Design an enzyme around this catalytic site. Structure first.
Site, short mmCIF file in Angstrom:
data_model
loop_
_atom_site.label_atom_id
_atom_site.label_comp_id
_atom_site.label_asym_id
_atom_site.label_seq_id
_atom_site.Cartn_x
_atom_site.Cartn_y
_atom_site.Cartn_z
N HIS B 41 0.80 -1.21 0.00
CA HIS B 41 0.00 0.00 0.00
C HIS B 41 0.85 1.29 0.00
O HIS B 41 0.27 2.37 -0.10
CB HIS B 41 -1.08 0.02 1.08
CG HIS B 41 -0.59 0.18 2.48
ND1 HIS B 41 -0.19 1.40 2.96
CD2 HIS B 41 -0.60 -0.71 3.49
CE1 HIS B 41 0.10 1.20 4.24
NE2 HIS B 41 -0.14 -0.06 4.60
N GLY B 143 2.14 6.10 10.15
CA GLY B 143 3.56 6.06 9.77
C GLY B 143 4.27 4.80 10.24
O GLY B 143 5.43 4.56 9.87
N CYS B 145 3.41 1.70 9.51
CA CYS B 145 3.33 0.59 8.56
C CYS B 145 4.69 0.16 8.09
O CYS B 145 5.58 1.00 7.94
CB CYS B 145 2.41 0.92 7.39
SG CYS B 145 0.73 1.33 7.90
O1 OQL Z 1 -4.36 1.66 8.88
C1 OQL Z 1 -3.56 2.43 8.35
N1 OQL Z 1 -2.52 2.98 9.00
C2 OQL Z 1 -2.19 2.80 10.36
C3 OQL Z 1 -1.52 1.68 10.85
N2 OQL Z 1 -1.26 1.44 12.15
C4 OQL Z 1 -1.68 2.35 13.03
C5 OQL Z 1 -2.38 3.53 12.68
C6 OQL Z 1 -2.84 4.46 13.64
C7 OQL Z 1 -3.53 5.57 13.25
C8 OQL Z 1 -3.80 5.81 11.91
C9 OQL Z 1 -3.37 4.93 10.95
C10 OQL Z 1 -2.64 3.77 11.30
C11 OQL Z 1 -3.69 2.86 6.88
C12 OQL Z 1 -4.41 4.22 6.79
C13 OQL Z 1 -5.89 4.07 7.08
N3 OQL Z 1 -6.48 3.07 6.20
C14 OQL Z 1 -5.80 1.93 5.82
C15 OQL Z 1 -6.49 0.91 5.16
C16 OQL Z 1 -5.83 -0.25 4.78
C17 OQL Z 1 -4.48 -0.37 5.04
CL1 OQL Z 1 -3.65 -1.84 4.60
C18 OQL Z 1 -3.77 0.63 5.67
C19 OQL Z 1 -4.43 1.78 6.10
#
Ligand code: OQL
Ligand code: OQL
Ligand code: CL
Lengths: 305, 305
Positions: B41, B143, B145
């Site tokens: 992603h 950030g 990821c």
């Molecule tokens: O979850 C994700 N990132 C994060 C990852 N970890 C902690 C986070 C804390 C706070 C905000 C974001 C965070 C991303 C962005 C949101 N939508 C999304 C959808 C699918 C996938 Cl694979 C990634 C994402």
């Protein structure tokens, strides 16, 4: 989201851990520049520990009596001296992995990461707090002496603890890196005990702010308190007194959540008087006191090293 | 003595963390040999995330659209490919700090250390378990990821998790290092929710054995149970079923303490019924389930108190 007991990344300290052997005793040493620091009790047999005269035991040792192993390399000891309860072994090689560092003595309530080691090899890393009774609730087995505690402030490793002993209650005692014990302990096999401990109030408040930041608000209430009334409650429940310095330090967390420090104190007072009523806070049924206000801000802001 | 939530020393993994940027998106990558692994992603904008066609988005990228920064050095991307939900960026420099490693896919109940990172820089290390619902209760901000989970039994790093996303309940989902998600999750902004989570029974039993090894027996009782009666009760408290594999795995701990597995099951049944009555077990007022039988044997003494 999420809130974990998080330690600093240990890599900068792992590159300093060595094995120190003197006769039949093997423990860990910290190799920084051309010096290896380790507990002075590395020179003692179990019988010597009953009543050691460290100057007398040390004068009988030569540089070659200390075997220092760094990975699969044997370092050459070219000098030795004692500073308080730490033995300093001068070696002929400066550690090429020596990070930017300082030796800092911490206060009770301050947290640090412990890199538990055996035979000069790091085994695990965990986060500890220096208890108000100057012990640490560590996890250490025989051979762990010389393991160190540290924090990272920017790109500098601040070494604050060196492991020396386990007390009969299973808690631990050690020194700063200048060999001064935390607490009224001596490096002798004599009757010693941890004093009655207290809860680190400012840290519990910091953790309640972490719970609010993470969405756990059930314990909030409409009430406030004075510092004087709150400290009467703190004294009653074996909590450390909360000072105006602690209130000031909690300012940023108070501003972020919109909950005044004395307003959070009124939540804590209620939790002490009534319990949690079957509820948990950040997955805990006990009030956690091993996160400082700085740890909370750091973990909730993602500071890197 | 002592029993802490202990992470593996993170140094071997810190030396692999890099920053990966594609356009406006920046996250972490894991640099092993001449390959940088990161969530696919990284090629998406927020709008792309609802129904991304990763093959279509990726075909539009060249090697020079990926910026990889390792410390203050920019690595050159010379190839790219997608394997499941991971992007693999071939670089022109093998990581000189690549440890001995393997990629392992873990099962629910397994624990691992997480090195949380931001902008390719490690921020902290903590211990996690793969929940029965295939999520992890991590501590991750935007950030994070690309941060990875791992174990380091011996000198070999076994990478088992790469962080991809946070679910609405604040828990986390990711993949193994081959890009296969744990659980029924997908790397898409579609409605996703963690299934009902349960307690990892075999881990709670392992932790009760840790408590006995460390000198506590208050929770033991004169009873035993059949495996099926234990499961009928435990499931009423949202505990995972205990299988004959779990009973076999607890054999060494049962032999060291002298407490049969089904005898410990009877103690767990009673703890579920009564609670702790103001008592704690290894400093906890709740039954801990993020220590495996293997973790307990690694951390605890081989001699019961
Ligand atoms: O979850 C994700 N990132 C994060 C990852 N970890 C902690 C986070 C804390 C706070 C905000 C974001 C965070 C991303 C962005 C949101 N939508 C999304 C959808 C699918 C996938 Cl694979 C990634 C994402
Ligand atoms: O406490 C010590 N070592 C340990 C340290 N940590 C965890 C241990 C677990 C199990 C056995 C030993 C452990 C040593 C040995 C006992 N006598 C003693 C007296 C004074 C001093 Cl400074 C050190 C010691
Ligand atoms: Cl597994």
């Amino acid at each position: 989201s999420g809130f974990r007991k998080m330690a600093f990344p240990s890599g900068k300290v792992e590159g300093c851990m060595v094995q120190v052997t003197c006769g039949t005793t093997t423990l860990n040493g910290l190799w920084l520049d051309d010096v290896v620091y380790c507990p002075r009790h590395v020179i003692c047999t179990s019988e010597d520990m009953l009543n050691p005269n460290y100057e007398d035991l040390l004068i009988r040792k030569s540089n070659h009596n200390f075997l220092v192993q760094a990975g699969n390399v044997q370092l050459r000891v070219i000098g030795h001296s004692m500073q308080n309860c730490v033995l300093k072994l001068k070696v002929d090689t400066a550690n090429p992995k020596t990070p930017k560092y300082k030796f800092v003595r911490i206060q009770p309530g301050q947290t640090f990461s412990v890199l538990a080691c055996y035979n000069g090899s790091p085994s695990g890393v965990y986060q500890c707090a220096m208890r108000p009774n100057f012990t640490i609730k560590g996890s250490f087995l025989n051979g762990s002496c010389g393991s160190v505690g540290f924090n990272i402030d920017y790109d500098c490793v601040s070494f604050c603890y060196m492991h020396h002993m386990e007390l009969p209650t299973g808690v631990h005692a050690g020194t700063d890196l200048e060999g001064n014990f935390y607490g009224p302990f001596v490096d002798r096999q004599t009757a010693q005990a941890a004093g009655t401990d207290t809860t680190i109030t400012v840290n519990v408040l910091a953790w309640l702010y972490a719970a609010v930041i993470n969405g756990d608000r059930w314990f909030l209430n409409r009430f406030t308190t004075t510092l004087n009334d709150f400290n009467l409650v703190a004294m009653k429940y074996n909590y450390e007194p909360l000072t105006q310095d602690h209130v000031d330090i909690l300012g940023p967390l108070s501003a972020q959540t919109g909950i005044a420090v004395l307003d959070m104190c009124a939540s804590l007072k209620e939790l002490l008087q009534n319990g949690m009523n079957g509820r948990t806070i950040l997955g805990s049924a006990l009030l956690e006191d091993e996160f400082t206000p700085f740890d909370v801000v750091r973990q909730c802001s993602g500071v890197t090293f």
